[PDB]
Design a protein around this ligand. Structure first.
Ligand code: SF4
Ligand code: SF4
Ligand code: SF4
Ligand code: SF4
Ligand code: FES
Ligand SMILES: [Zn+2]
Lengths: 123, 38, 208, 71, 688, 114, 84, 117
């Protein structure tokens, strides 16, 4: 047995170096690259970090850099388990919101009226 | 057409060693101050 | 359906259905989910207290030998509320069959090591310690394999960014070969390839 | 500031240019409506695209072909 | 109550009596392939690419436009649906050129993200492919109408929201084109917004045109500041440089639409820019300097002057974080005397609870109004997306709109009521018709614009319209509360600036001659050195050098709007934090951190260093600058309206004229408009 | 907290275990200074150890302290023997790396907000 | 100086703040009829402890915390600072 | 079908057969290619910078087969061995020179072997 019940907040340290207090994370819902119309790109809460300098490598023009995180997207399933990872490793954050549209009221056949204003042509 | 004359070589420093460079225009083109008169 | 589509058979799809039916019937203290893979393989979910006995039941028996440990591996999964995933894999040499043992876990909760049951998993368990940080209990020799003497990241997990922190170099400032902060000469471009329209209707998630 | 890397290195650069070597082509004429240009020979060169040649009268070098094409 | 239980794929779902098969199947999480149907448009049936096999029926119907009767079995995946989608989308991919090496929608186009997933596997034509010719429309929209799946989606745009009826359908059978029959150019506001609508590579961008394919960009969301409502964009960096920006489809502002100026003005970010601190040299010379020369230079003069001989003006596009480090530096030395560039008259209130200074009916309440009256403004070329919301709400239900002053071109049938300030005074009484329809209104809306209030009679027209806003609300008023009196703007960082506790209108500096000024206004010439006293210095802090940076003592660089995490506030008190895209080039720095290193090299040192400590200093002064995107219910202006009756200024004799031209004033306005040469290249194509 | 511990139970066997291995490292500073032929002063090697244990004293929980033990227990394999060829030990002493400013005004001249 | 202005914070609801919601009804139009110099500010929502800032003497803060007064205590606790 | 030094062909009388369609850079497994196009003044689009490292080049043959307009070709000459790392970075205007030192070599190869692929 020896199950030793208590309560203490799980915070871990030692594994990164100094980027705990310097960088605030960011959790967002990605929203539909609008040149197309497919909505599979939504439905996953992600997180993503800050952007820092990108100078020029003065022999070609390669945008070389420090900032070793810079390419990390994780895919979390929900808000409830979103913030439950920024605390267990212990860095700050800021939370966006999910936006779902108007339900809405559309009806073909309402484009032809007797006294109303919605009446389309040129089709 | 567009063929070379006889041949060439891969000469490590001949003195010519091709010394690669960048092939773009500069990006931001910083603004210069106005002239010496006021 | 046509050529260039894999033909299945219902023989092994019925036998491996029927066989591992009674591995949940005769040890219902540990086994908490069994599902049959469509390509004639078996998965069996086991609570981490049953790490030693359900191997030990398998290890010697008349009906299920499974005497070869092919592959011990480990997968990490954020958003699961219990991170990792330990996956055992065995081989019935008398019977030509496969079964996988999928035991979930966490970081701080230890796992009783399978050193005494199989002596194949001596090196398969020192390794996983280095790559994720799972602390296998009472291991006879736990050490540092496949990493340098200075890594403190356990790099095969999702929190370690791809290039490290410790990009190395030489200098003549004394004689030594010394570390540095990481310094790339190219960005490592991150392309975006995940295209919409949800092409797979069978595996579709519930709507919510 | 930058030009010191080729001191005594002869700075090997291109000699011919195709920035405009289009213009020496005797721009082809047909007297039709739409023409194919899989230019450069079959099973090589750019894919076949059909251009409308009716302005007063040019095509537009196919987008791929480069060679000035017209009626 | 009032629903039909309809079974999709053998699974129940409850929909209203009058929805579509499209929306109902989109409720349980499925996307039928769409071409001829966008949500914010009307509905047509002219591509036939949603073909659901409805169960227990011989025929196949379109799920775009039909009702849903008593509970069907909407059977999506069958063996008759999948023989139709595969058969329709072999037709249109026949008469089509063989691009995708060079066509610019090579990353997203929906003849390509259908045709792996749905649709066929190989081609059988095997020769043909008719080829129509292109033309020009404007210097914004490259137009290759060879590609053209003829879905009639761009044409229903023009007859809808952007009310210029210019495009058409010309021909019969296979022989038809889309573009304008005469050689007329098609240009207005929202004119470049069609290149998102166009589902294949026909309409594509002119300045972006051939630079980069869209699987390489790094999308980071951000908010744009060139206008009143702000925006909702997403920038797209390639290698540390902005390539193009898009809309982001917030549901209340930018429903899916973006403004044309806000789309094509990223060039002004990177053309004509100042990068380094510069020293005086005593003549009209002005030369660059190392960073530790010109810090204690200006900080020497702070210890000398005291009292109201030092001031600052700031009225452009700087945030609400580099407007706190200014206010706590000039008022710890106790010399406030500072104002914004914009002129706003105060009579009884204006800095305190502001009472109408934010737009009280929000944008989402505009669709609920019934009689909208608006005075003193040309709403078309300032906040255009608010104008498009009127255009939507004028359609789809009834609305009655009247305007006072300067007959201009609005796309919906208004009526020019009158053109004088004296129309306001008479409409407080009952005369000159509509006369009581505001009294006979159920949800009124009376907008004052900020174009007329800048004038010299601003304290009169502020109190005049507040009287008739009192007159309606004291009658019933609406049902109901329904806040009435409201205002919009045309400068982005004013509501952010003014509700920190500044004064409005440059009058305090307009009377006295203080010695040193700090310019963050600045390019509007409401103060010149001639209106100033003699050659005593002014120190300039900005990022562009158009007007005011040549006439300056020491200039300091700053980061513009894509380089710093900031805060901006539109006309409803929302707070929309822009985020980092590029780090600022050269020796430029962020604005609010050059102020602390001006402070700490001088005497007073401010008690905050990091950005989180800045926003707690914000939360001290105004607690609603961390309540992001929320509109609270607080009006409190029955007390303000009687207290604003204190000033008794009268009207004037001048027609309430807006500055805006036919279009041409729309392009070149702020600062980034000016340096961006594509605005300079689309302005001479208007005049010709 | 329903999970078995590693070695300790609650706050007492742990905070005598961490005091045990400190007496190992205090003994095994002046051995490696000649076992690798490295020429510094011996008091430098003792300063780094008493620096290192004070770093982690913000813990209010068992089996996190026990996790740091296992790392601290492991290093005495390599360090007391000869498995690090003079170079993996000397990385704790950042001799090459330039000093960081760590004060506000010196960051502002050089570097875009580190 | 002192002084320059003050900052009346409140909350829209959580009705322990209800003294200011009557104080605006009683003494704002009577309050700001006096002192046509001092631009006292009203802001939105502290949501708890509806404080009242004062700012004067080279930018120094003085913050009383009226949590739940009457309509008459807020009538008289303002001229603690307004007189001084 | 041998793999080796790189080249960029061009049409009969020259057109610089490349069209900057950005595929030879998206299936390099090693991310060697670095293309930055621009609308050239005549209207047809071309490259400005084109960069192939000869050290990250893992020698697939994935550039050779992804190209629609049949331009970039792994040319059949293993002549190499320069003395500086500053040199093996290739520009655009090396490859053309290196691709017009021969085309009698390359076009004899591709005509033999395009019939299979
Ligand atoms: S521009 Fe082309 S794709 Fe767009 S609606 Fe017109 S024909 Fe269809
Ligand atoms: S519009 Fe469609 S068919 Fe034309 S090039 Fe683009 S993806 Fe190909
Ligand atoms: S060779 Fe082909 S893939 Fe490479 S740049 Fe040219 S067109 Fe693009
Ligand atoms: S050979 Fe392969 S790795 Fe090398 S440049 Fe070509 S595609 Fe890239
Ligand atoms: S699919 Fe668009 S019309 Fe039915
Ligand atoms: Zn051609």
């Amino acid at each position: 047995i020896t199950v030793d019940e208590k309560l203490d907040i799980t915070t871990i340290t030692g594994v990164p170096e100094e980027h705990i207090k310097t960088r605030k994370a960011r959790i967002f819902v990605p929203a539909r690259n609008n040149m197309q119309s497919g909505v599979n790109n939504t439905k996953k809460w992600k997180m993503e970090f800050d952007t820092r300098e990108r100078w020029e490598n003065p022999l070609m023009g390669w945008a070389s850099t420090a900032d070793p995180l810079s390419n990390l997207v994780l895919t979390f399933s929900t808000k409830e388990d979103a913030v439950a990872f920024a605390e267990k490793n212990g860095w700050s954050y800021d939370v966006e919101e999910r936006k779902v549209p108007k339900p809405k009221s559309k009806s073909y056949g309402a484009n032809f009226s007797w006294n109303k204003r919605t009446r389309v042509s040129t089709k | 057409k567009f063929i070379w004359t006889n041949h060439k070589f891969n000469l490590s420093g001949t003195p010519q060693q091709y010394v690669p460079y960048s092939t773009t225009r500069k990006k931001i083109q910083e603004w210069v101050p106005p002239s010496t008169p006021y | 359906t046509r050529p260039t589509v894999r033909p299945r058979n219902d023989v092994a799809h019925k036998q491996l259905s029927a066989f591992g039916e009674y591995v949940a019937e005769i040890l219902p203290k540990y086994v908490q989910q069994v599902q049959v893979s469509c390509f004639n393989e078996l998965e069996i979910c086991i609570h981490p207290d049953g790490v030693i006995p359900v191997l030990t039941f398998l290890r010697d028996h008349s009906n299920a030998q499974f005497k070869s440990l092919a592959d011990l591996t480990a997968v990490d999964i954020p958003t699961r509320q219990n991170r990792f995933e330990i996956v055992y894999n065995l081989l019935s040499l008398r019977f030509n069959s496969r079964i996988r043992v999928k035991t979930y876990t966490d970081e701080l909760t230890p796992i009783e090591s399978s050193v005494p049951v199989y002596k194949a998993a001596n090196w398969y368990e020192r390794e996983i310690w280095d790559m994720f940080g799972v602390f296998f209990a009472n291991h006879p020799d736990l050490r540092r394999i496949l990493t340098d003497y200075g890594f403190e990241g356990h790099p095969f997990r999702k929190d370690f960014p791809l290039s490290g922190y410790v990009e190395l170099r030489y200098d003549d400032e004394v004689k030594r070969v010394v570390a540095e902060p990481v310094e790339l000469a190219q960005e490592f471009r991150k392309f975006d390839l995940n295209s919409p329209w949800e092409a797979f209707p069978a595996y579709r998630q519930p709507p919510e | 500031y930058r030009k010191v890397r080729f001191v005594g290195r002869q700075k090997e650069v291109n000699e011919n240019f195709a920035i405009d070597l289009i213009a020496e082509q005797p721009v082809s004429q047909v007297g039709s409506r739409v023409i194919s240009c899989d230019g450069g020979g079959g099973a090589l060169g750019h894919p076949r695209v059909y251009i409308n040649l009716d302005k007063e009268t040019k095509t537009g070098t196919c987008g791929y072909c480069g060679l000035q094409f017209r009626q | 109550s009032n629903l039909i239980e309809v079974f999709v794929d053998g699974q129940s779902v409850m929909v209203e009596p009058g929805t579509t098969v499209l929306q109902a199947c989109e409720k349980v999480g499925m996307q039928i392939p769409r071409f001829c149907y966008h949500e914010r448009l009307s509905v047509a049936g002219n591509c036939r690419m949603c073909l659901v096999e409805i169960e227990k029926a011989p025929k196949v119907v379109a799920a775009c436009a039909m009702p849903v009767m008593k509970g069907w079995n909407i059977l999506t995946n069958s063996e008759k649906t999948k023989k139709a989608r595969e058969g329709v989308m072999e037709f249109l991919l026949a008469n089509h050129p063989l691009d995708c090496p060079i066509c610019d929608q090579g990353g997203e186009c929906d003849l390509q993200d259908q045709s792996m997933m749905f649709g066929s596997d190989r081609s059988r034509f095997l020769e043909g492919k008719r080829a129509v010719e292109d033309k020009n429309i404007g210097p914004l929209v490259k137009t290759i109408m060879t590609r053209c799946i003829q879905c009639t989606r761009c044409i229903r745009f023009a007859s809808e929201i952007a009310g210029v009826d210019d495009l058409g359908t010309t021909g019969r059978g296979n022989d038809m084109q889309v573009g304008t029959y005469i050689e007329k150019m098609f240009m207005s506001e929202l004119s470049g917004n069609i290149i998102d609508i166009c589902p294949v590579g026909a309409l594509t961008s002119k300045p972006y045109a051939f630079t980069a394919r869209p699987w390489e960009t790094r999308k980071t969301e951000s908010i744009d500041v060139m206008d009143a409502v702000g925006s909702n964009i997403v920038v797209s960096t390639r290698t540390g440089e902005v390539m193009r920006i898009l809309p982001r489809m917030h549901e209340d502002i930018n429903e899916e639409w973006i403004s044309d100026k806000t789309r094509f003005a990223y060039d002004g970010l990177k053309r004509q820019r100042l990068t380094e601190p510069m020293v005086r040299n005593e003549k009209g010379l002005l030369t660059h300097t190392t960073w530790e020369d010109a810090l204690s230079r200006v900080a020497g003069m702070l210890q000398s002057f005291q009292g109201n001989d030092v001031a600052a003006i700031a009225g452009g596009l700087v945030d609400a974080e580099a407007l706190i480090a200014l206010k706590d530096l000039l008022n710890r030395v106790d010399s406030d005397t500072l104002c914004t560039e914009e002129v706003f008259p105060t009579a009884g209130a204006g800095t305190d609870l502001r009472s109408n200074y934010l737009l009280n009916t929000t944008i989402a309440g505009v669709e609920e109004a019934d009689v909208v009256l608006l005075v003193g403004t040309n709403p078309r070329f300032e906040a255009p997306l608010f104008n498009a919301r009127i255009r939507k709400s004028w359609l789809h239900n009834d609305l009655k709109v009247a305007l006072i002053g300067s007959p201009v071109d609005l796309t919906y049938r208004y009526d020019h009521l009158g053109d004088s300030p004296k129309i306001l005074q008479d409409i407080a009484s009952g005369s000159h018709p509509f006369s009581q329809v505001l009294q006979e209104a159920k949800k009124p809306m009376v907008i004052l614009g900020s174009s007329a209030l800048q004038r010299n009679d601003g304290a009169a027209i502020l109190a005049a319209v507040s009287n008739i806003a009192q007159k309606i609300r004291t009658s019933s008023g609406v049902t109901g509360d329904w806040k009435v009196m409201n205002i919009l703007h045309r400068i982005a960082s004013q509501v952010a600036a003014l509700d920190l506790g500044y004064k409005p209108g440059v009058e305090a500096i307009q009377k006295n001659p203080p010695k040193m000024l700090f310019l963050l206004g600045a390019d509007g010439g409401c103060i010149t050195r001639q209106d100033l006293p003699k050659d005593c210095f002014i120190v300039y802090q900005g990022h562009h050098g158009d007007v005011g940076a040549p006439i300056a003592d020491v200039i300091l660089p700053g980061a513009a709007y894509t380089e710093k995490s900031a805060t901006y506030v539109n006309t409803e008190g929302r707070a929309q934090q822009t985020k980092v895209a590029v780090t600022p080039p050269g020796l430029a720095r962020e604005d609010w951190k050059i102020i602390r290193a001006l402070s700490e090299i001088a005497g007073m040192t401010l008690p905050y260093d990091t950005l989180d400590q800045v926003r707690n200093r914000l939360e001290e002064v105004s607690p609603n600058l961390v309540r992001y995107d929320d509109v609270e219910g607080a009006n409190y202006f029955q007390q303000a309206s009687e207290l604003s009756k204190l000033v008794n200024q009268q009207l004037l004799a001048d027609p309430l004229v807006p500055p805006q031209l036919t279009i041409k004033d729309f392009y070149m306005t702020d600062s980034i408009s000016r340096a961006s040469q594509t605005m300079a290249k689309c302005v001479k194509a208007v005049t010709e | 907290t329903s999970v078995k511990p590693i070695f300790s139970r609650d706050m007492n066997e742990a905070k005598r275990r961490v005091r045990e291995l400190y007496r190992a490292w205090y003994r095994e500073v002046p051995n490696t200074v000649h076992l690798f032929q490295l020429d510094i002063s011996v008091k430098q090697g003792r300063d780094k150890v008493r620096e290192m244990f004070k770093k982690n004293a913000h813990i209010t929980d068992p089996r996190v302290v026990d996790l740091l033990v296992i790392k601290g227990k492991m290093e005495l394999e390599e360090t007391i023997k000869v498995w690090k060829q003079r170079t993996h030990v000397m990385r704790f002493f950042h001799e090459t790396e330039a000093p960081r400013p760590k004060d506000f005004l010196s960051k502002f001249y050089v570097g875009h907000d580190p | 100086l002192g002084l320059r202005e003050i900052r009346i914070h409140l909350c829209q609801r959580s009705p322990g703040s209800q003294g200011v919601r009557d104080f605006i009804e009683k003494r704002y139009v009577e309050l700001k009829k006096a002192n046509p110099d001092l631009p006292i500010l009203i802001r939105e929502c502290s949501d708890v402890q509806p404080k009242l800032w004062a700012r004067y003497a080279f930018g120094q803060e003085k913050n009383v915390s009226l949590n739940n007064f009457s309509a008459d205590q807020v009538t008289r606790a303002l001229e603690n600072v307004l007189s001084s | 079908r041998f793999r080796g030094e790189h080249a960029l062909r061009r049409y009969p009388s020259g057109e610089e057969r490349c069209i900057a369609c950005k595929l030879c850079e998206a299936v390099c497994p090693a991310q060697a290619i670095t293309i930055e196009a621009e609308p050239r003044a005549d209207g047809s689009r071309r490259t400005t910078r084109y960069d192939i490292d000869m050290t990250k080049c893992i020698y697939c043959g994935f550039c050779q087969e992804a190209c629609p307009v049949d331009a970039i070709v792994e040319g059949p000459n293993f002549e190499f061995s320069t003395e500086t790392h500053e040199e093996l970075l290739y520009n655009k205007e090396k490859l053309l020179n290196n691709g017009d030192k021969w085309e009698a070599e390359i076009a004899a190869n591709i005509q033999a072997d395009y019939l299979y692929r």
